[PDB]
Protein backbone atom coordinates (compact mmCIF):
# COMPACT_ATOMS: atom_id res chain seq x y z
CA UNK A 1 0.00 0.00 0.00
CA UNK A 2 1.24 3.48 -0.79
CA UNK A 3 -0.11 5.81 1.91
CA UNK A 4 -1.02 9.41 1.46
CA UNK A 5 0.92 11.80 3.66
CA UNK A 6 -1.96 12.71 6.00
CA UNK A 7 -3.35 9.19 5.82
CA UNK A 8 -0.06 7.84 7.18
CA UNK A 9 0.14 10.54 9.85
CA UNK A 10 -3.33 9.50 11.05
CA UNK A 11 -2.43 5.80 11.07
CA UNK A 12 0.78 6.49 12.99
CA UNK A 13 -1.15 8.57 15.53
CA UNK A 14 -3.80 5.87 15.90
CA UNK A 15 -0.99 3.43 16.75
CA UNK A 16 0.54 5.70 19.39
CA UNK A 17 3.62 6.87 17.49
CA UNK A 18 2.87 10.57 17.85
CA UNK A 19 5.37 11.99 20.35
CA UNK A 20 6.61 8.49 21.15
CA UNK A 21 9.97 8.83 22.97
CA UNK A 22 9.55 12.57 22.41
CA UNK A 23 9.48 12.38 18.61
CA UNK A 24 6.65 14.40 17.11
CA UNK A 25 4.46 12.94 14.39
CA UNK A 26 6.20 15.00 11.70
CA UNK A 27 9.48 13.24 12.51
CA UNK A 28 7.92 9.84 11.86
CA UNK A 29 6.20 10.96 8.65
CA UNK A 30 9.43 12.53 7.40
CA UNK A 31 11.35 9.35 8.16
CA UNK A 32 8.79 7.24 6.31
CA UNK A 33 8.86 9.63 3.33
CA UNK A 34 12.58 9.23 2.80
CA UNK A 35 12.83 5.58 3.82
CA UNK A 36 10.00 4.22 1.67
CA UNK A 37 8.15 7.07 -0.03
CA UNK A 38 5.17 5.87 2.06
CA UNK A 39 5.16 2.43 0.38
CA UNK A 40 4.60 -0.46 2.80
CA UNK A 41 6.03 -2.92 0.27
CA UNK A 42 9.43 -1.21 0.01
CA UNK A 43 12.46 -3.49 0.39
CA UNK A 44 16.15 -2.74 0.02
CA UNK A 45 19.19 -5.01 0.20
CA UNK A 46 22.16 -3.78 2.26
CA UNK A 47 25.84 -4.35 1.56
CA UNK A 48 26.12 -6.67 4.58
CA UNK A 49 23.43 -8.97 3.17
CA UNK A 50 20.66 -7.81 5.49
CA UNK A 51 17.45 -6.30 4.05
CA UNK A 52 15.31 -3.30 5.07
CA UNK A 53 11.55 -3.77 5.04
CA UNK A 54 8.45 -1.62 4.93
CA UNK A 55 7.44 1.97 5.49
CA UNK A 56 10.26 2.57 7.97
CA UNK A 57 12.83 0.27 6.31
CA UNK A 58 13.40 -1.85 9.40
CA UNK A 59 16.53 -3.97 9.11
CA UNK A 60 16.81 -7.78 9.34
CA UNK A 61 20.24 -7.66 11.01
CA UNK A 62 18.58 -6.87 14.35
CA UNK A 63 14.84 -6.51 14.21
CA UNK A 64 13.06 -9.16 12.16
CA UNK A 65 13.55 -12.63 10.72
CA UNK A 66 13.91 -13.20 6.99
CA UNK A 67 15.84 -16.48 7.09
CA UNK A 68 18.70 -15.15 4.98
CA UNK A 69 20.68 -12.79 7.20
CA UNK A 70 23.43 -14.90 8.82
CA UNK A 71 24.21 -14.13 12.45
CA UNK A 72 21.27 -11.76 12.80
CA UNK A 73 18.69 -11.28 15.52
CA UNK A 74 14.89 -10.91 15.51
CA UNK A 75 14.31 -8.51 18.41
CA UNK A 76 10.80 -7.52 17.31
CA UNK A 77 9.90 -11.23 17.15
CA UNK A 78 8.29 -11.02 13.72
CA UNK A 79 8.85 -12.27 10.20
CA UNK A 80 10.20 -9.39 8.11
CA UNK A 81 7.26 -9.94 5.75
CA UNK A 82 4.94 -8.62 8.47
CA UNK A 83 6.59 -5.24 7.92
CA UNK A 84 5.21 -5.14 4.35
CA UNK A 85 1.52 -5.34 5.25
CA UNK A 86 -1.02 -2.64 4.38
CA UNK A 87 -1.69 -2.62 8.14
CA UNK A 88 1.20 -0.72 9.75
CA UNK A 89 0.77 -2.24 13.23
CA UNK A 90 3.85 -4.48 13.06
CA UNK A 91 6.05 -1.69 11.67
CA UNK A 92 4.90 0.73 14.37
CA UNK A 93 5.35 -1.70 17.25
CA UNK A 94 8.80 -2.61 16.03
CA UNK A 95 9.73 1.06 15.48
CA UNK A 96 8.81 1.72 19.12
CA UNK A 97 11.41 -0.85 20.19
CA UNK A 98 14.02 0.51 17.78
CA UNK A 99 13.64 4.15 18.87
CA UNK A 100 13.91 3.07 22.52
CA UNK A 101 17.23 1.23 21.92
CA UNK A 102 19.52 4.12 22.86
CA UNK A 103 20.11 6.41 19.88
CA UNK A 104 16.55 7.55 19.34
CA UNK A 105 15.62 8.19 15.73
CA UNK A 106 19.29 8.27 14.72
CA UNK A 107 18.75 4.53 14.18
CA UNK A 108 17.23 5.65 10.87
CA UNK A 109 20.23 7.12 9.02
CA UNK A 110 17.85 8.82 6.55
CA UNK A 111 16.05 10.52 9.44
CA UNK A 112 19.39 11.79 10.69
CA UNK A 113 20.47 12.94 7.23
CA UNK A 114 17.21 14.37 5.89
CA UNK A 115 14.76 15.08 8.74
CA UNK A 116 16.73 15.82 11.91
CA UNK A 117 16.84 19.55 12.59
CA UNK A 118 14.41 20.44 9.78
CA UNK A 119 10.87 21.83 9.91
CA UNK A 120 9.34 18.39 10.32
CA UNK A 121 5.92 19.84 11.21
CA UNK A 122 5.56 20.57 7.49
CA UNK A 123 4.97 16.83 7.05
CA UNK A 124 1.69 16.98 8.99
CA UNK A 125 0.62 20.49 7.94
CA UNK A 126 -2.99 20.64 6.86
CA UNK A 127 -3.72 17.15 8.14
CA UNK A 128 -6.93 16.54 10.05
CA UNK A 129 -5.43 14.74 13.03
Q: Is 52 a catalytic residue?
A: yes
| Phi, psi (deg, nearest 5) at residue 2 | -100, 110
Nearer to Cl ion, 100 or 109 (CB): 109
121 makes contact with Cl ion (CB under 5 A): yes
Q: What is the spatial distance between Cα 104 and Cα 38, in angstroms, rounded to a whole number? A: 21
106 makes contact with Cl ion (CB under 5 A): no
Q: Is 35 a catalytic residue?
A: yes
Q: Which of 18, 20, 26, 105 binds Cl ion (CB under 5 A)?
A: 26
Stretch that binds Cl ion, among 26-34, 42-50, 75-83, 100-108 (CB under 5 A): 26-34
How many positions of this chain bind Cl ion (CB under 5 A)?
8
69 makes contact with Cl ion (CB under 5 A): yes
Q: Which of 13, 24, 104, 127 binds Cl ion (CB under 5 A)?
A: 24
Q: What is the DSSP letter of 97?
A: H
Q: How far is CA 107 from CA 3, 38, 96, in A?
A: 23, 18, 11
Residue by residue, DSSP assigns 29-89 as HHHHHHHHTTBTT-EEE-TTS-EEETTTTEETTTS-B-S-STT---TT-SBGGGGGSSS-H
110 makes contact with Cl ion (CB under 5 A): yes
> Which residues define the annotated binding site for substrate?
101
Chain residues in the site for Cl ion (CB under 5 A) = 24, 26, 69, 72, 110, 113, 120-121
Amino acid sequence: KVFGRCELAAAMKRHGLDNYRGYSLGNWVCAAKFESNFNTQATNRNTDGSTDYGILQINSRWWCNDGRTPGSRNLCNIPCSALLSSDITASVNCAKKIVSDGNGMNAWVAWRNRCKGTDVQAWIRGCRL
